[PDB]
């Protein structure tokens, strides 16, 4: 499917759902 894999936040390492573009824990953007 289009969304791909869960992503580990660069800032805190939390493993995020691929539909989110900001970290669920620390709110930092996935991409920068």
């Amino acid at each position: 499917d289009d969304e791909g894999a869960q992503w580990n936040c660069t800032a805190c390492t939390f493993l995020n759902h691929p539909a989110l573009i900001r970290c669920e824990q620390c709110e930092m953007p996935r991409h920068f």
Binding site: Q6, F14, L15, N16, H17, A19, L20, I21, E24
Partner: protein, 72 residues
């Protein structure tokens, strides 16, 4: 019980719910409050998408938990 539902656009919706509410019920409450049809809603907590037939308690969602709402 108060929970927060954060949208992709940075809005924090505040809902009154019960731990025994189903995910389906939570989507219905979001519909009532915000006007978003339930079939357009995806709810996420602790990195995972929540399923309609489960309850908030099944996911250990409690007072002042933050869910994330993504639209189809």
């Amino acid at each position: 019980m108060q929970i927060f539902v954060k949208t992709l656009t940075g809005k924090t919706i505040t809902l009154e719910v019960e731990p025994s509410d189903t995910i389906e019920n939570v989507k219905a409450k979001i519909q009532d409050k915000e006007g978003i049809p339930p079939d357009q809603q995806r709810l996420i907590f602790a990195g995972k998408q929540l399923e309609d037939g489960r309850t908030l308690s099944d996911y250990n969602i409690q007072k002042e938990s933050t869910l994330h709402l993504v639209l189809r």
